[PDB]
Design a binder for this molecule. Structure first.
Ligand SMILES: CCCCCCCCCCO[C@@H]1O[C@H](CO)[C@@H](O[C@H]2O[C@H](CO)[C@@H](O)[C@H](O)[C@H]2O)[C@H](O)[C@H]1O
Ligand SMILES: CCCCCCCCCCO[C@@H]1O[C@H](CO)[C@@H](O[C@H]2O[C@H](CO)[C@@H](O)[C@H](O)[C@H]2O)[C@H](O)[C@H]1O
Ligand SMILES: CCCCCCCCCCO[C@@H]1O[C@H](CO)[C@@H](O[C@H]2O[C@H](CO)[C@@H](O)[C@H](O)[C@H]2O)[C@H](O)[C@H]1O
Ligand SMILES: O=c1[nH]c(=O)n([C@@H]2O[C@H](CO)[C@@H](O)[C@H]2O)cc1F
Ligand SMILES: O=c1[nH]c(=O)n([C@@H]2O[C@H](CO)[C@@H](O)[C@H]2O)cc1F
Ligand SMILES: O=c1[nH]c(=O)n([C@@H]2O[C@H](CO)[C@@H](O)[C@H]2O)cc1F
Ligand code: NA
Ligand code: NA
Ligand code: NA
Lengths: 404, 404, 404
């Protein structure tokens, strides 16, 4: 029953303690409250009626903003994003390049506008402030964790840019973990446009802030002592659009290459596997077989653990975007394998994070430019930070599966 | 009758004098001849039969070059830019991304070729020379004003690059104004492809050179004393294509975001306005209500001033590209509001300029890279330069409305 | 009969000797073996049954990898790259932008992966080693020649990056020639997707390594004495995808502009030619008339020399991509002129090279960044290097025509 989920949470916590830089330095108030907040946040918005309605209200607003942004997309690509496409090409009428990627551009511009207006800083200041008061975490790392709810791993530390170079190793690690445990407002809308339930995306985003601090302070407790704009709104929007464009181009090229490379890998695996009586061997089977125990531990039913393992493994060995690209068909009526609604939720939560090895190089560049003398520390803590970020996503999935 | 237009010209002139840095320093020969040239140029090509035929001949040549350039576009996107699109998707068969944006690439390559060959420098030298002889303006600022007829605000000063750092404040201001009062050959073809009459675009482009000098020397008279390549033609074309590509990408991302943001703004305005019994409230209504007097002043009929105000206001608060994107449907048979041919012309002229606040940041980067120690002056004069550029566009529209 | 081909080879060799920096410094072992290898390589894979089967086996593998990579393309553009496009738009259903350009992205990512794994370095070390042992060429220039079989002119010298600044002038020239005589794995797949026979592309690529050294050591003999990474595999793929994206964008913009410019040139040539009773005058006719003797010399039949001259000339005056874009329709059933299979092969080989004037500027940037103090030498030897590269392509075509 629910016992398997509670065991799941315990195992995830235990692994973090086992990988800790110093278990005797672990602050019980910090890691105790962090888990408490992430657990309670999950309980509130996924179980408690009022919180469920607040989540639903927030998600529908996000859904409306996406539709508003699609007017710009409709202007540029016209009939290629109209209903006629489904009449002519059927399911192939949904052109990913024109349906999903332009949303990254619109949302990046929007976020930039909300930063210029001070709306973002206002929300981050409140959320980040509440975290440090309850957990005893430092001012800077708490703000970065809260900022990561809405923006990406390289953009979130910008709210505390001047404090980054003199951050303690534990602070720097938490900052890295905050980004790895979360996603970004831009791609959230993208994943939502792919069929992923907005409620899950919004929930996982908010739960990433305490979850990121949780596993950061478990695996890298504080052993040191911490310390302590565009000309107009139109310029802000333009700057965001440009950043979104570059992101859209990068994501699109990555998807073309990685999905293509997976197909090539599967072709080779067919020949190699055939030598062992397994000509049907594919990458999905390997990842499914290898990540099935992990999926089962976080609450996925026995008969759905292997399929769930495919996406979870793919997210880890590559990135969450590619994983979502393969999981999205399972959210439609044309799903090759009909999964339970709880399993769908677990996969959605467990995928909702930038936690992968390639994000280390991203952190080295973006976060490293803010503090060039700390690039050595970032590379040194990269793998552990990814692990911490992965555990945070897994914990969020286990919690979500519990109240569902 | 025509009295309203003459009042319009007077008001525009008066505002410039009211905003002058020193009215007693205004050179009557300079600003008198500048208005005379812009007025006579308008009279010649819009009223006088011979000039009308020369304008028509030039516009058709421009129309032919665009069709020639569309062969490259047709090669890349094939059936998606063919007539079959209109059979399948109807009006939505016109894909803006593939129809309009690639023209920016072809024309940028062409302009780069005409620069390598010396054709551009030849024309600019003649036009710029005639301006300084008649107006008494300096050599450098006259060439920049003439260059702005064909190229953008950041590219035009390149013809006098080494003279920019030591320019007087009045010279630097005029250079800024020359770019703000005009557009570029690349986007001109884009706007033409959207349905905007080429004759109006060509006319407004040429009239921008004296018009830009007019309001620059009215608002910032000279109080000081002025002073005074690719390896081959194929490389030139390639360089232009690359520049055009970057422009095309920037414009496309901007349009997706801004049009999307306008839709979001209208959604919010519907709720906010509803609190005051105006749930139908939209951005177009605000801009229309606010810019209707200005439209009426430049010659737009009373019953068309509000609709004309929508586009004029949008051009000012955002940019001319977005404005043209909303005005283009009014140039087709499927126009939601059938406007008079004079009103169509007035709007076309009044929109034909880079005069907006966001162009200040553009000038800071492009023009600023030519003279890094003058970036402070550019930012200081930015708003006034935009105003001067706006007045120049408005004057051109009033003149156009007069002879029509 | 075959006598015309042997004369062709002799003429090409003679021209190189005539243009030599020092004929008495020409190493007979080097240039004798280089021609021997290129000739024997051609004989082996185009005539000898076993070699023909090895070429066919390699080409089919390349064909399979391309299809695998098209899965990523199919994901992004859906129905726009499906069979339905041919039902709706007929021949125009083949959208070049979505069919060909994305292959550059996938293959660039793949090559980057094969570099990270050490597979590329392994092959290059063997091929490059065999060349220097047989020809007596230096270690560095032999590796660069072998690397150019698979990658582009700017990427190939990276395998010997630290040796480039101290290279002899003859070494630097050979390095330039190796890149000009060949293409790249990315665009090879692109040309293959356009209908160009993979066997010819693969053959020309391998034959470029000895061919490049041949004409480099003929035109610039050695008169001096020579001397002597991404964090993980996923990062490698991502880096390659990004590089491929930039390449894809550059190629697409170039094609839009150049094909558009050719159409404009033809429009002007129609008017100019009309003054001399030739209103049908076009660029293709000029290039065809001018390059027909050259085509005839390399083995193209008399009645097909003019048509063959169009593409060969276009490749030289512009680039091979544009040439292939005009030659591709002649490889289909809807070919305006049905050409012999030997003529098709000759054109395919003669076009398979980056040898053009615009590549000089490319070499100045890419190869020049590896040795900034040698940019003067690169520019000085640019034209001769292009000639050498052109002769190498022509020789490969003549050889191919001989055994066919
Ligand atoms: C898509 C389908 C197929 C999936 C295939 C799975 C591929 C996963 C292999 C990952 O390889 C490792 O990744 C690390 C992370 O980058 C590297 O560490 C490098 O970077 C670390 C992080 O900074 C450092 O700690 C290390 O010292 C440094 O070796 C490490 O060398 C590398 O071997
Ligand atoms: C699209 C639909 C919605 C439309 C909404 C309308 C938005 C317009 C607001 C413009 O805001 C102002 O723009 C100036 C121009 O950038 C800024 O001046 C800044 O830049 C100037 C120019 O250099 C300087 O003179 C100023 O000192 C400096 O404050 C100024 O601060 C800023 O408040
Ligand atoms: C597409 C259809 C139409 C086709 C039209 C054909 C155009 C071909 C003209 C080429 O022009 C030459 O190209 C050289 C190569 O770049 C230039 O040399 C320049 O660069 C060389 C190479 O480094 C140097 O040796 C030279 O000194 C330097 O002048 C040279 O000046 C330039 O006149
Ligand atoms: O804002 C972003 N920042 C970022 O780094 N990414 C990277 O792109 C990958 C795919 O979304 C993520 O795993 C992450 O590594 C994506 C983003 F959308
Ligand atoms: O060449 C150009 N230069 C330029 O700055 N722009 C900018 O892009 C906006 C939209 O066309 C213009 O208002 C102007 O600010 C556009 C151009 F086409
Ligand atoms: O890898 C490449 N490197 C390169 O320089 N190019 C350039 O792009 C032109 C068109 O393919 C080539 O002639 C060559 O000059 C293309 C490439 F694909
Ligand atoms: Na984040
Ligand atoms: Na201009
Ligand atoms: Na090469």
């Amino acid at each position: 029953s629910l016992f398997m989920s509670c065991c799941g949470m315990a195992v995830l916590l235990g692994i973090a303690v086992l990988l800790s830089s110093n278990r005797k330095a672990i602050n019980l108030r910090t890691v105790g409250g962090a888990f408490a907040i992430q657990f309670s946040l999950g309980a509130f918005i996924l179980y408690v009626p009022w919180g469920q309605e607040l989540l639903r209200g927030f998600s529908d607003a996000v859904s409306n903003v996406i539709n508003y942004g699609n007017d710009g997309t409709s202007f540029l690509f016209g009939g290629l994003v109209s209903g006629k496409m489904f009449e002519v090409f059927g399911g192939g009428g949904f052109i990913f390049a024109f349906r999903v990627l332009p949303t990254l551009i619109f949302f990046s511009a929007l976020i930039s506008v909300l930063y210029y207006l001070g709306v973002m800083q206002w929300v981050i200041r409140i959320l980040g402030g509440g975290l440090q008061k309850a957990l005893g975490t430092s001012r800077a790392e708490s703000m970065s964790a809260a900022a990561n709810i809405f923006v990406g791993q390289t953009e979130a530390p910008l709210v505390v840019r001047p404090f980054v170079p003199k951050m303690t190793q534990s602070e720097l690690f938490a900052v890295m973990c905050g980004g790895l445990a979360s996603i970004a407002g831009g791609v959230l809308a993208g994943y939502a446009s792919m069929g992923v339930k907005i409620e899950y995306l919004v929930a996982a985003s908010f739960m990433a802030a305490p979850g990121g601090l949780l596993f950061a302070k478990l695996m890298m407790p504080e052993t040191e002592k911490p310390q302590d704009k565009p000309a107009n709104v139109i310029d802000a929007a333009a700057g965001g659009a440009s950043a979104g464009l570059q992101l859209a181009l990068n994501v699109g090229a990555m998807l073309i290459a990685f999905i293509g490379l997976i197909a090539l890998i599967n072709g080779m695996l067919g020949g190699i596997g055939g030598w062992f009586g397994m000509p049907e061997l594919k990458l999905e089977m390997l990842l499914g077989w290898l990540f099935a125990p992990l999926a089962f531990l976080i609450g996925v039913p026995w008969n759905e653990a292997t399929v769930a393992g495919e996406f979870i493994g793919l997210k880890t060995v590559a990135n969450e975007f590619v994983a979502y690209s393969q999981f999205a068909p399972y959210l439609t009526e044309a799903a090759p394998v009909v999964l339970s609604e709880k399993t769908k939720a677990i996969i959605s939560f467990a995928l909702c994070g930038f936690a992968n090895l390639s994000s280390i190089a991203i952190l080295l560049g973006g976060l490293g430019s803010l503090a060039p003398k700390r690039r050595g520390d970032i590379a040194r803590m990269g793998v552990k930070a990814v692990i911490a970020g992965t555990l945070s996503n897994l914990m969020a999935a286990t919690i979500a599966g519990f109240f569902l």
